[PDB]
Amino acid sequence: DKVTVITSPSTEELVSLVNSALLEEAMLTIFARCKVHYDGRAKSELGSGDRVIIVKPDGSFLIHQSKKREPVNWQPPGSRVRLELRENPVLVSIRRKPRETLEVELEEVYMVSVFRAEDYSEAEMAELIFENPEVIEPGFKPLFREKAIGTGIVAVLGRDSDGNIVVLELKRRRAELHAVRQLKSYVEILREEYGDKVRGILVAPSLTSGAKRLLEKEGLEFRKLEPPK
Amino acid sequence: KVTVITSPSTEELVSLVNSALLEEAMLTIFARCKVHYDGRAKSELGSGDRVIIVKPDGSFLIHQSKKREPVNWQPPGSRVRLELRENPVLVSIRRKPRETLEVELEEVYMVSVFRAEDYEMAELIFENPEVIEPGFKPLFAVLGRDSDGNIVVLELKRRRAELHAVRQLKSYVEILREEYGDKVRGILVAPSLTSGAKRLLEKEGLEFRKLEP
Helix, strand or coil: CCEEEEECCCHHHHHHHHHHHHHHCCEEEEEEEEEEEEECCCCEEEEEEEEEEEECCCCCEEEECCCCCCCCEEECCCCEEEEECCCCCEEEEEECCCCEEEEEEEEEEEEEEEECCCCCCCHHHHHHHHHCHHHCCCCCEEEEEEECCCCCCEEEEEECCCCCEEEEEECCCCECHHHHHHHHHHHHHHHHHHCCCCEEEEEECCECHHHHHHHHHHCCEEEECCCCC | CEEEEECCCHHHHHHHHHHHHHHCCEEEEEEEEEEEEECCCCEEEEEEEEEEEECCCCCEEEECCCCCCCCEEECCCCEEEEECCCCCEEEEEECCCCEEEEEEEEEEEEEEEECCCCCCHHHHHHHCHHHCCCCEEECCCEEEEECCCEEEEEEECCCCECCCHHHHHHHHHHHHHHHCCCCCEEEEEECCECHHHHHHHHHCCCEEEECCC
């Protein structure tokens, strides 16, 4: 029961999902043609128009119009939300301290949705590669690991299926551009010595797309690995 | 107006995203996702359930289950494209300054497409006086007569009524009380009042009626 969705709901349906959401501490999201009234210190009035309404379990109220960025009207966490029936169903958000009120009259509700959403060491990578070389490449033979020459960089030297030297630069975190530059340098050294057979490979959970660009541009490669925890 | 799909295969996802991009419609997707944001400015957030809203103007909004502001967002005047990968990724490109915001969609709960784009009375009282109260006789702000033969004051406002004309109504019914005394009544006519206006209206004894142009 992760997501409930009712498209063009009825009154009893709307009240059902809305109240169930409010009670169950879930995220309520409603796409609607509505009319907006903000009564308070800074007065605001919005007429009929298509809007997205977002009500968080902590009380946060958000009204998003068709454009821009920020909400056209919003209420802070800790505020109070309730659905009261009138000629058309009305979503009332009461912020306290200071006490101000935001009423959203729902003219037509196109969609109502209840979204239940929960809140909230590179060496082990190397040793993992050694334990199972079949992670990186087929018939991959790892040879040795090496670290901390003039830096903190870690590396794995090995041989591939067809015999070429392979360097592996491991990054615990997401792989930046800098990592690709260092890998490139290692590779160009190894190239200078053992010849051009050698190919380097980046090992890291992911990368910035810039890093992928630089990778495909300098002839290097990438391999996906997730650090154990 | 609204097109929704629950637990989509990547075909459905990419289809609906392309539909949002083509038709200039609002794209809303509830998903458990992993959030990467990179550039000269850097932000990284792990797995969790989030709501993803892409507006036709290029605005990108990623909302978590709490607080208020988006957990990550991209300004209006940007570029959003969905690319298939290990898991399908929404990539929002901001240029000048150039930074990029990608969400890896691990589990996609729903995908939705949504359309867009929004952005005197005195005579009406004279004609059909039953508008104010049953058995109402209008005379000549607006002065009138309640069927008990009483002075009835009307102060008319067009849009939502704050407390200004409530003070006005108080003073008007007060001088009308100087002449004609008790049972003389002021009335606030407007499509809507404010809580303050409502309370001041109720305490000082005045009244209210619903009328819209």
